[PDB]
Design an enzyme around this catalytic site. Sequence first.
Site, PDB file in Angstrom:
ATOM      1  N   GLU A  35       0.805  -1.200   0.000  1.00 42.57           N
ATOM      2  CA  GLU A  35       0.000   0.000   0.000  1.00 42.57           C
ATOM      3  C   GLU A  35       0.846   1.261   0.000  1.00 42.57           C
ATOM      4  O   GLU A  35       0.578   2.198  -0.751  1.00 42.57           O
ATOM      5  CB  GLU A  35      -0.929   0.033   1.219  1.00 42.57           C
ATOM      6  CG  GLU A  35      -2.064  -0.964   1.191  1.00 42.57           C
ATOM      7  CD  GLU A  35      -3.069  -0.736   0.074  1.00 42.57           C
ATOM      8  OE1 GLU A  35      -3.026   0.309  -0.598  1.00 42.57           O
ATOM      9  OE2 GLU A  35      -3.930  -1.609  -0.131  1.00 42.57           O
ATOM     10  N   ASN A  46      -7.434   9.688  -5.960  1.00 41.02           N
ATOM     11  CA  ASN A  46      -8.151   8.877  -6.926  1.00 41.02           C
ATOM     12  C   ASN A  46      -8.987   9.890  -7.685  1.00 41.02           C
ATOM     13  O   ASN A  46     -10.033  10.333  -7.210  1.00 41.02           O
ATOM     14  CB  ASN A  46      -9.027   7.864  -6.197  1.00 41.02           C
ATOM     15  CG  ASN A  46      -8.214   6.949  -5.280  1.00 41.02           C
ATOM     16  OD1 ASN A  46      -7.332   6.223  -5.743  1.00 41.02           O
ATOM     17  ND2 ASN A  46      -8.496   6.995  -3.972  1.00 41.02           N
ATOM     18  N   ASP A  49     -12.927   9.164  -8.458  1.00 41.06           N
ATOM     19  CA  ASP A  49     -14.041   9.400  -7.564  1.00 41.06           C
ATOM     20  C   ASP A  49     -13.811  10.534  -6.571  1.00 41.06           C
ATOM     21  O   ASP A  49     -14.618  10.715  -5.667  1.00 41.06           O
ATOM     22  CB  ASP A  49     -14.480   8.111  -6.857  1.00 41.06           C
ATOM     23  CG  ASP A  49     -13.444   7.579  -5.876  1.00 41.06           C
ATOM     24  OD1 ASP A  49     -12.481   8.287  -5.556  1.00 41.06           O
ATOM     25  OD2 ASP A  49     -13.610   6.446  -5.386  1.00 41.06           O
ATOM     26  N   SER A  51     -11.618  10.879  -4.103  1.00 43.96           N
ATOM     27  CA  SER A  51     -11.277  10.506  -2.738  1.00 43.96           C
ATOM     28  C   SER A  51      -9.758  10.352  -2.686  1.00 43.96           C
ATOM     29  O   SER A  51      -9.108  10.267  -3.722  1.00 43.96           O
ATOM     30  CB  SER A  51     -11.985   9.208  -2.324  1.00 43.96           C
ATOM     31  OG  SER A  51     -11.465   8.087  -3.020  1.00 43.96           O
ATOM     32  N   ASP A  53      -6.352   8.328  -0.539  1.00 42.77           N
ATOM     33  CA  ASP A  53      -5.914   7.264   0.358  1.00 42.77           C
ATOM     34  C   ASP A  53      -4.792   7.852   1.191  1.00 42.77           C
ATOM     35  O   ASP A  53      -3.890   8.484   0.650  1.00 42.77           O
ATOM     36  CB  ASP A  53      -5.438   6.050  -0.434  1.00 42.77           C
ATOM     37  CG  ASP A  53      -6.539   5.451  -1.272  1.00 42.77           C
ATOM     38  OD1 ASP A  53      -7.679   5.389  -0.779  1.00 42.77           O
ATOM     39  OD2 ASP A  53      -6.276   5.057  -2.428  1.00 42.77           O
ATOM     40  N   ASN A  60      -9.034   5.143   2.986  1.00 39.62           N
ATOM     41  CA  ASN A  60      -9.854   6.015   2.134  1.00 39.62           C
ATOM     42  C   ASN A  60     -10.743   7.077   2.798  1.00 39.62           C
ATOM     43  O   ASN A  60     -11.528   6.785   3.724  1.00 39.62           O
ATOM     44  CB  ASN A  60     -10.658   5.140   1.170  1.00 39.62           C
ATOM     45  CG  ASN A  60     -11.269   5.928   0.024  1.00 39.62           C
ATOM     46  OD1 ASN A  60     -12.446   6.264   0.060  1.00 39.62           O
ATOM     47  ND2 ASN A  60     -10.495   6.174  -1.014  1.00 39.62           N
TER      48      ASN A  60
END
Length: 130
Positions: A35, A46, A49, A51, A53, A60
């Site tokens: 990750e 991202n 959408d 959002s 991380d 998220n």
Amino acid sequence: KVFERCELARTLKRLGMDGYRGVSLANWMCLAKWESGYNTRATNYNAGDRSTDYGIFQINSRYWCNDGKTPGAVNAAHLSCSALLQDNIADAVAAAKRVVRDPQGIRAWVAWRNRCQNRDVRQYVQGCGV
């Protein structure tokens, strides 16, 4: 902060992650490795959408932490996403515990399915003394 492998292993163990909701320490290590590469300041937008991380576990902003700029957001872990960018990972670990506490378990992270599920993950904690 970029953690050294065994250093992270022992920290997660001390924070009660080994076997949390059935997830072995080696699995959490495999997840953090892919990750963020054990990097606490890792962020990933991202564009699809809107959002983001955050942190070592790439949590998220739409469901687990609040960053104010994510549309249709919910705060299930009830933390500021800023808390997930600290060198001290206590909050990031608490958010991770909240995520797996949901019905998907560790599968919530698609990266875990791609790179950890059904594999030999012993290598992530080998020699660490945990």
